[PDB]
């Protein structure tokens, strides 16, 4: 049982047959945002979705037959289980919001071939080193939306009204969106120091970044 | 046999003459755009340009037997051919869509001055070294994109009722434009939990923008 | 007396005591944000605060006696000085400015951290190398602050009205926020030449900007 | 005597002298800003005013006769002389625009300090390895914006009109200043296809901008 499976799982045609799939998965989940393509032709789509979701069910089954508690120590693996897993419940209606976290399987080309799956790999590579810079980036922006919210939140409340307000504008400023004639010139109206406020938040928001930069670029 | 031709060709001479009339004619096309000069000196210009084409349509012709197979293998060349082409397409079969596309030949001044060809030739250079990102890049717009029509369109035609729209505006939010006072911000009126999607399409996006960059930088 | 005072302090429980304390007046203030809480258990907090920033008191005191004269040249812990000095100002004094500045004495979560200390030096660093670049543009920003308010000022009052006015007017411009239909445009009505003061000035700003971030680099 | 003027000049008084005069004068053109100031004050600066541009006219006169032609080949005194110079034409009988090109004398102290002229020439010395990249740009811009003004100054005068016009837009796209909901969702009413022609040019101007910096930092 272990030994048939083995020589199916790993050859050029398992792996090629699901990567084919995805492919072909994505271009007709294009088509089911067509509200035209869905009257005349989505009740093909839909059951093609069931077929798929099965054959890759039983894909991650026999990976997991076969690799055993190797398995799960495989991040790119474990990827594939979870987006595959939550892509499994049937639409159902008992809720929308998870039907469309489905589309996610289309991350499962990224999984499954080799000259992405090292980009992406690459790239997470750069994050550790930053998870300070992060961490900081967040209390200083906490620190900041506390300000936030009691010096704005009263004559400003949609913009600063709340915590979570604030944390969102704050980000919105850091991007530099539309921030002065959007947002500071107004609260300027009202409180004409803000711009002490918003400058040294936009000096040092931007400092870090570029530092954050600079040492992803020297590292 | 036929040599001399071969000959006539390769002058340092002709080279730049070649060069001064594209150089001339992109002066005159730019005299095209003011409406003054085109209604009393039109007919010159739209000789001139008559003229032009034609001379270059024997250009090409005549190196096409000099080069033969290698011709048509010169990617100088092969935009050479078509944008001499273009200005071929008769200017009243069809949309006056054709008749806007011949400026494209303007770049022709790119093609025939090697350091302009450099320039070019390098940036081209660093793409090939990008084409695992841009695959990656685009499938991830692609799948944020589909999300967006499932969870906004209905309410939020304009922007997101379709993919080409979702991508558009996914594309916009990427380049950072306007995108919360004038996207996000409505969105969440209606669907207040928006910033799940958005925000961390940004942290993502602008976070494979940066590291790529760096990555030219290095090799 | 001295050395056992300077043995607790010192001690890795006190600390870990004092930044959990840190850590828990922070969860505190983001809880004070929903104003059903505060109306209904309010006054828990605001004297868990007094009682928080006594032992903070405490401590403040004891690592100068500790330290003698050595704890005033210490960058890191002269700021833990004024940054709660300032929390012993009443809520009820000056202004209500003060209540406010009361929140940077998260930024001891720095302090107290060495992780984040190790981050902020760091970053701290690069500043000297700058200063001179940093000279050089206030001065530039200085005299555009000049020739923008009295140029604009009369029938732009908002935006150039005052030096003041200009100079906040022409950082947004290099924010590069709006600053086309936003700001120029407008201008442009009235001055028709109006662009060939900011798109120079562009140039000028974004260029010293890169070089200066390139400068970085190499320092 | 001798040129005993010359001894002078060189003299680590003179210089102090007129960067001390320069920094009084950038004082004075200062409060020349305040309308309350004009009042109580404003005999008081135009007397300042005339002694130091009497001053520096003089500091100007010696300095070529030192210097002869070789004070026309240094470019800190040719910039030196124009900018003197314009302070001295008549403030009426024409264009009052001149009244205010007289404050660019405070660009002076970076005149007579060397460290802001070490700077200067810092930062020009980055423009001749780039000039090759401006030219090519320049030439897209300039067929692009011709491009713009045929196929949207009809319906579109305000922003395409005139090539003037396209291309003080185009830079403005380039800039990314709000050029989505701003520029080519309106044109989008009119003429659907809009983003087969901004959106690939919003691709290239950004390659080449991203990669010029890199050409910058690696050498
Ligand atoms: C040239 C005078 O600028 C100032 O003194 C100001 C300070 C001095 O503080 C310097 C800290 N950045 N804070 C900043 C930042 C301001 C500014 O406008 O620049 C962005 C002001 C200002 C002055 C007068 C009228 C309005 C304003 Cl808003
Ligand atoms: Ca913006
Ligand atoms: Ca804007």
Known sequence: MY?????????????????YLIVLNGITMG?????????????????????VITIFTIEIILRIYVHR????????????????????????????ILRVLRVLRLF?????????????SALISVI????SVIALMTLFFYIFAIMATQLFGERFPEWFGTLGESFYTLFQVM????????????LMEVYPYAYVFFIPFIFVVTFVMINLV?????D
Chains 1, 2, 3, 4 share one sequence.
Do not use: C, H
Request: glycine residues 4%; proline residues 5%.
């Open 128 to 131: 550790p080193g930053m998870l």
């Open 108 to 120: 499962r080309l990224v999984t499954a071939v080799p000259q992405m799956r090292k980009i992406v």
């Open 31 to 51: 088509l089911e945002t067509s509200k035209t393509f869905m009257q005349s032709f989505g009740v093909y789509t839909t059951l093609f979705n069931q077929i």
């Open 3 to 19: 030994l048939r499976i083995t020589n199916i799982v790993e050859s050029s045609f398992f792996t090629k047959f699901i990567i």
């Open 175 to 186: 991007t530099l969106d539309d921030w002065s004639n959007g947002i500071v010139r107004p």
């Open 69 to 96: 508690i190797s398995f799960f120590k495989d991040p790119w693996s474990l990827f594939d289980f979870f987006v595959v897993a939550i892509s499994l419940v049937p639409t159902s209606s008992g809720f929308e």
């Open 214 to 218: 600079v040492a992803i670029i020297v």
